[PDB]
């Protein structure tokens, strides 16, 4: 005589073999004997009808149309519509919600997270005619045109990111399928291992809430609970008394993802799943309205990822590239992860595998990487569950090991998982409620930001995460989070002229014996910082760690020079729309000049570069853009030199000689901050000096793993970058410092055919560069700090609209 009565969908999960009545009884195959009869009632379906109005409460029924259903909180959601002549929520005009309009005893507005699997961003416009409820939320509330998922653009990684504010590499759910070599265990969609708590790192919202005294409803719903029942359960929970009622709830829909896989993102069959999801939204909103909570609850309508057209004929097979294909294990599909089939195979060499997968067919539809060489914006490396070899797959394609795998399983027309900047992978965000703004459209943002906001909505302190708290304040009417700029840890030195030329023995020559007093005070003033206001538009960056460095001023650029790394941490310069490009004179071709402000012992030397047959050098401030022949000499200072592989110099030279001036023309001047990054342990964080794995031969000169640039101008491009009154515009890059161009399959062509495509692939947020350098940018603008935080999280994705 099993005991689920009274306990249907329990919040305090009890301990088996005492029988369960919650969303993980079904998932464990261990429900109390009568769960299905008591907790999954369906008799008479989900809608009141005229003839049910005022009925005699009968507890077999799925939901109720009896008089007493409201204070019980178990009416069918259309009860007041059918039996009281009330209107559907979707038929009421939008009215601003200026304050929460909540029953007494509510201590904060509840939050409902309505998550929709595979809801591609473009469905909001393309399906608007068949989703009236969703369209009301979007138009009346706060929405973005799209929301960026994390990579990989799969379900578990994304939903767990939403819950935690963490990148996959930090929370540990790095794919829908995974092998952990520490546990020696596999995580799969089908089956039970995925439930073990050691997979799931960070602190998800339901725990953050509970630890701070805020009760949560379930986040994981069994696939056997119909959607209408999930909705009714939420509404029932919302009717509980004060001391038991949760404040945060989640609803999950497996659609439109399930149908998008079968039919493709825009298959004609997709219209019905979109209508069904809208109806479910309408049920929730009508249900809240009956409870007088429709102007009390904050609702978030959010997806995990989009959906692209993918068919079994667009499959790449590794057996067409590798003679040795049976010696590897592939995690396949819309990304590839490769590891050895046996770790006892001493033959298995990842470099030979990468080499055999690189630019072998002319329109090859995947590109192989060592995971540390993946674009840093993906943040997809610092986890032992991520295999060393990664294949980034072109949108619309699959990769598989051998052809049998794809014909012992074309059944599907849709898939997802690709690079998170791909337009088809973008998803949705709408926020509706008293805490969200009214009829407001906000720019696109990343789903890692939402955890912080959900915490702000609930009055919770978020666990440490990868969002930038405050960057989404512009979504919110109140409960904004007002952070303070991080404190500078190291104050700069400001060295004057302290060394004579003969103190330097650098192996460096400069054939420059090229000797007024009007001009002599002029050069002195430039060295003392007289043009700094022009080249350092937003103040100097703050150094957020302990180190020794010098500010160096010049006519055309300013730098923060590290005595520890023997090069600039940052170099900052402004190029106006009218700047002229010039070429390096021959009296200066291999010229490098001692910097008499900086000791020989804290300087680079040219002999190390001569000796190092693989390493050459470039400059952070480009000599090509110097303002005068006198100022050009500053660009050849040893303190503006950085180590560069010759293959990388092709990239860098094209950027400096062609692209910067192009950007200045297009944007009405640009301010550029460039520098090195050292991330030898691929954790996305600045390396300390003891982490550096490579030096210029025979020297203490460390070799960067990457070079960054941050390119800022006026959002109103009719104002010049140096005289901007309002909001700013930025694009940035973190380019991999590689000794070959194997990544660029067209690299034998001229740079105008491949360098810009490389830079687009390695586009970056300012915030990414901050983590990687320990610098804080944009310290002195006339803009609000939250606006600046938004700017620092911006990613220029170079996708069409
Ligand atoms: C994105 O946001 C996140 C969150 O803010 C950032 O991640 C943090 O990065 C911090 C710096 O790397 C990191 O701090 C370390 O924590 C160690 C203790 O960590 C444990 O406890 C915490 C707290 O509850 C917990 O969060 C951790 O969770 C990780 O591990 C579990 C497995 O048990 C996973 O389930 C979970 O997914 C998570 O994994 C991720 O992080 C770990 C590293 O912590 C990675 O290896 C995984 O791949 C994955 O990315 C832990 O359970 C602490 O020991 C470290 O301190 C060492 O270093 C300093 C140096 O001065 C020293 O003071 C310490 O004593 C210690 O040094 C000694 O140990 C060294 C290492 O063993 C040893 O080599 C030395 O010789 C010394 O003896 C360090 O403080 C913090 O853990 C994570 N948090 C999370 C959740 O990931 C992330 O950086 C952000 N990303 C970007 C790009 O900004
Ligand atoms: C295959 N699969 C997919 C997801 N799923 C299932 C059942 N129910 C859920 C929904 O899960 C969530 C919903 C939300 Cl909204 C958030 C947040 N934030 C987090 C989760 C996780 C997953 C528990 C982390 C299921 O069978
Ligand atoms: Ca999904
Ligand atoms: Ca690092
Ligand atoms: K060299
Ligand atoms: Na190449
Ligand atoms: Zn899917």
HEC string for 528-595: CCCCHHHHCCCCCCEECCCCCEEEEECCCCEEEEECCCCEEEEEEEEECCCCCCCCCCHHHCCECECC
308 vs 419: CA distance, rounded Å = 12
12 vs 524: CA distance, rounded Å = 73
Structural domain including 556 reads: 501-793
Q: What is the atom index within ligand 2 of the atom nearest the CA of 115? A: 15
In three-state secondary structure terms, 522 is helix
785 vs 445: CA distance, rounded Å = 17
Active-site residue numbers? 155
Taking a 5 Å cut-off on Cβ, the residues next to ion ligand 3 are 117, 155, 257, 304
The CATH number of the domain holding residue 769 is: 3.40.570.10
**Cβ-count burial 199-238 (b if 16+ within 10 Å, e if not):** bbbbbbbbebbeeeebbbbbbebbeebebbbbbbbbbbbb
Write the residue with the smallest CA distance to atom 7 of ligand 1. Answer: 170
The answer, yes or no, to whether any atom of ligand 2 lies below 6 A from the CB of 453, is: no
Close Cβ partners of 532 (under 8 Å, ≥ 6 residues apart): 553, 558
CB 60 within 8 A of CB 43: yes
Neighbours of 54 (CB within 10 A): 9
Is 419 annotated among the ligand-binding residues?
no
Closest CA to 170 of 381, 345, 1: 381
Close Cβ partners of 485 (under 8 Å, ≥ 6 residues apart): 542, 776, 779, 785
Phi-psi region of 758 (alpha: psi -120 to 50; beta: other; left: phi over 0): alpha
The answer, yes or no, to whether any atom of ligand 1 lies below 6 A from the CB of 685, is: yes
Six-digit token pair at 768?
Answer: 């990414």
> Distance, CA 389 to ligand 7 centroid (Å)?
24
> Residue with structure tokens 């009330």?
86
Q: What is the atom index within ligand 1 of the atom nearest the CA of 379? A: 93
In three-state secondary structure terms, 317 is strand
Q: Ligand 1, from 170, 772, 775: best to mutate by most atoms within 8 Å of Cβ?
A: 170
Q: What is the atom index within ligand 1 of the atom nearest the CA of 170? A: 50
Write the residue with the smallest CA distance to atom 13 of ligand 2. Answer: 219
CB 701 within 8 A of CB 617: no
The answer, yes or no, to whether any atom of ligand 1 lies below 6 A from the CB of 382, is: yes
CB 565 within 8 A of CB 702: yes
């Amino acid at each position: 005589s099993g005991s689920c009565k009274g306990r249907c969908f329990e919040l305090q999960e009890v301990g088996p073999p005492d029988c369960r009545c919650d969303n993980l009884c079904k998932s464990y195959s261990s429900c109390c004997h009568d769960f299905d009869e008591l907790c999954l009632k369906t008799a008479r379906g989900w809608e009141c009808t005229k003839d049910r109005c005022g009925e005699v409460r009968n507890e077999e029924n799925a939901c109720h149309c009896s008089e007493d259903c409201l204070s019980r909180g178990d009416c069918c959601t259309n009860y007041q519509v059918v039996c009281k002549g009330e209107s559907h929520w979707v038929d009421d005009d939008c009215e601003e919600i200026k304050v929460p309009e909540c029953p007494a005893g509510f201590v904060r507005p509840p939050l409902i997270i309505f998550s929709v699997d595979g809801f591609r961003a473009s469905y909001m416009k393309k399906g608007s005619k068949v989703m009236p409820n969703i369209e009301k939320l979007r138009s009346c509330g706060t929405h973005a045109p799209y929301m960026r998922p994390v990579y990989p653009t799969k379900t578990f990684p994304n939903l767990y990111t939403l819950a935690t504010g963490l990148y996959p590499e930090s929370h540990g759910i790095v794919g829908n399928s995974m092998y952990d070599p520490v546990f020696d265990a596999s995580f799969h969609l089908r089956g039970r291992e995925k439930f073990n708590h050691r997979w799931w790192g960070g602190q998800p919202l339901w725990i953050t809430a509970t630890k701070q005294g805020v009760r949560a409803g379930t986040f994981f719903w069994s696939v056997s609970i119909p959607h209408e029942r999930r909705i009714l359960t939420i509404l029932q929970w919302l009717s509980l008394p004060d001391n038991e009622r949760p404040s945060v709830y989640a609803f999950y829909s497996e659609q439109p993802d399930f149908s998008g896989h079968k039919y493709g993102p825009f298959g004609p069959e997709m219209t019905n799943p979109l209508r069904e999801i809208d109806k479910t939204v309408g049920q929730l909103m009508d249900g809240l309205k009956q409870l007088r909570l429709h102007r009390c609850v904050n609702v978030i309508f959010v997806g995990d990822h989009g959906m692209e057209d993918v068919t079994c004929d667009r499959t790449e097979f590794l057996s067409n590239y590798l003679t040795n294909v049976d010696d590897i294990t592939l995690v396949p599909g819309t990304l590839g992860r490769i590891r050895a089939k046996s770790i006892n195979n001493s033959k298995y060499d990842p470099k030979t595998i990468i080499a055999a997968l690189t630019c072998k067919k002319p329109d090859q539809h995947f590109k192989p990487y060592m995971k540390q060489h993946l674009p840093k914006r993906l943040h997809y490396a610092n986890n032992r569950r991520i295999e060393d070899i990664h294949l980034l797959v072109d949108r619309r394609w699959h990769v598989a090991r051998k052809p049998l795998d794809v014909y012992k399983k074309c059944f599907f027309q849709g898939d997802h998982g690709f690079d998170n900047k791909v337009n088809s992978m973008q998803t949705v965000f709408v926020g509706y409620g008293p805490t969200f703004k009214y009829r407001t459209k906000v720019p696109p943002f990343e789903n890692i930001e939402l955890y912080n906001v959900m915490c702000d909505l609930l009055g919770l302190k978020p666990a440490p995460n990868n969002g930038t708290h405050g960057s989404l304040n512009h979504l919110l009417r109140t409960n904004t989070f007002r952070p303070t700029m991080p404190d500078e840890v190291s104050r700069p030195n400001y060295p004057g002229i302290m060394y004579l030329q003969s103190e330097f023995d650098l192996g460096c020559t400069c054939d420059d014996k090229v000797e007024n007093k009007l001009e002599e005070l002029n050069k002195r003033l430039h060295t003392k910082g007289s043009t700094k206001e022009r080249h350092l538009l937003y103040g100097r960056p703050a150094v957020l760690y302990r180190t020794s460095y010098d500010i160096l001023y010049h006519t055309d650029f300013e730098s923060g020079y590290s005595e520890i790394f023997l090069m600039p941490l940052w170099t900052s310069y402004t190029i106006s729309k009218q700047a002229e490009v010039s070429s390096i004179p021959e009296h200066l071709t291999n010229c490098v000049r001692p910097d008499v402000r900086v000791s020989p012992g804290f300087s680079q030397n040219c002999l190390a570069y001569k000796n190092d047959k693989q390493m050459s050098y470039g400059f952070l401030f480009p000599p090509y853009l110097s303002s005068s022949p006198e100022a050009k000499y500053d660009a050849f200072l040893v303190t503006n030199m950085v180590p560069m592989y010759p293959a990388f110099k092709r990239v860098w030279a094209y950027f400096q000689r062609v692209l910067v001036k192009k950007y200045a023309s297009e944007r009405n001047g640009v301010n550029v901050i460039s520098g090195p990054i050292f991330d030898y342990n691929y954790d996305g964080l600045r390396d300390t000096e003891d982490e550096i794995k490579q030096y210029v031969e025979g020297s203490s000169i460390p070799v960067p793993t990457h070079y960054y640039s941050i390119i800022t101008s006026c959002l109103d491009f009719t104002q010049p970058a140096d005289k901007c009154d309002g909001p700013l515009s930025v694009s940035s890059f973190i380019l991999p410092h590689r000794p070959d161009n194997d990544e660029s399959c067209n690299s034998s062509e001229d740079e105008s055919k491949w360098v810009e495509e490389l830079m687009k692939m390695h586009t970056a947020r300012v915030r990414d560069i901050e983590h990687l350098t320990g610098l804080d940018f944009y310290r002195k603008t006339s803009r609000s700090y939250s606006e600046i935080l938004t700017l620092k999280t911006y990613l220029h994705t170079y996708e069409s609209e």
